[PDB]
Paper text:
Recently, mutational screening analysis identified the chloroplast-localized HJ resolvase MOC1 that is essential for chloroplast nucleoid segregation in Chlamydomonas reinhardtii and Arabidopsis thaliana. MOC1 exhibits dimerization and an RNaseH fold, belonging to the retroviral integrase superfamily. Moreover, we characterize a base recognition loop (BR loop) that protrudes into the junction and disrupts the C–G base pairs at the crossover.
In this study, we determine the crystal structures of HJ-free Zea mays MOC1 (ZmMOC1), Nicotiana tabacum MOC1 (NtMOC1), and HJ-bound NtMOC1 at resolutions of 2.5 Å, 2.0 Å, and 2.5 Å, respectively. We first determined the crystal structure of HJ-free ZmMOC1 (T107-V280) via iodide-based single-wavelength anomalous diffraction (I-SAD) at a refined resolution of 2.5 Å and the structure of a quadruple mutant NtMOC1 (N108-S275, I112V/Q162K/E235Q/239Q) at a 2.0 Å resolution.
Numbering used by the authors:
A (entry chain C), B (entry chain C): 3 to 72, 74 to 169
């Protein structure tokens, strides 16, 4: 009855949809790291795992995670993408959750965002239409990570946008 | 009293040194994946975790893992490197182990392999000198992953090569 959505990137989030209709979303924890004298962010492994071990989702809950691709930042931009992705899939399988990777094109096309002039903005609107109680948590432009994780869970659950304006 | 060494790559291995002097080494489990019509290998997350949960190393054992760098295969060659690395560090932290990353230059320089004409061959020799009971398991050229994992654990433990020939 539960479902999890994971935007695995820095700036991402993990969302939990419960069978009683309620939802939750948590920002991905991160630390700082200096790579070649440049300040980078890096996911916080311990905080992610402890977050997963504190969820109310029963073991076996399916986690829908975006398997993405950054090709204009190149080396150590794909290392970061694979690192964050490998970190999340391992943390989920170790917490008792089943993992289903979803292409970014797939969940965006389902919610009609594939060719959006404002993709991050529309995802927050689409996420607040599905979960109006998260409207506070989708206010800022930096909340598109929370929105993607919610849409990833909503796609995996098969939710549909109600008829109305966008 | 225990120590773990992890060559995180495909073709890598995980080694366990016990306080009674004995040692073990396991090949990294993998699956096949077709990426852009090309057959690739990819670490087996479930088999890695189950392997970690079956070790006799008590919780809190430090795991020394190589943090490496492949720059002549480029895109999706660094995604693979970060993916395997993120997969391992998450699987280790989730199994109760503490992680200490070690540069490839660091452990190679400690065992005098930094400027070796035959780096993979010498690592197997160095590993069989430290652990002669693994001589059978270091016979083939493809066993350099097992050797690296053993040397990673031997470095983290502070072992020294006895005086003698190489």
């Amino acid at each position: 009855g539960w479902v999890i959505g994971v935007d695995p990137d820095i700036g991402g989030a993990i969302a939990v949809l419960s069978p009683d209709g309620s939802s939750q979303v948590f920002d991905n924890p991160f630390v700082h790291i200096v790579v070649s004298e440049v300040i980078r962010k890096r996911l916080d492994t311990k905080s992610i795992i402890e977050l997963l071990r504190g969820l109310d989702a029963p073991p076996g809950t399916t986690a829908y995670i975006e398997k993405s691709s950054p090709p204009t930042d190149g080396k150590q931009g794909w290392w970061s993408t694979g690192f964050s992705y490998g970190l999340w899939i391992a943390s989920l399988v170790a917490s008792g959750f089943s993992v289903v990777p979803v292409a970014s094109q797939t969940w965006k096309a389902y919610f009609g965002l594939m060719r959006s002039e404002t993709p991050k903005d529309d995802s927050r609107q689409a996420a607040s239409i599905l979960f109006p109680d998260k409207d506070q948590s989708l206010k800022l432009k930096k909340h598109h990570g929370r929105a993607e994780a919610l849409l990833l869970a909503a796609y995996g659950k098969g939710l549909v946008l109600p008829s109305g304006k966008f």
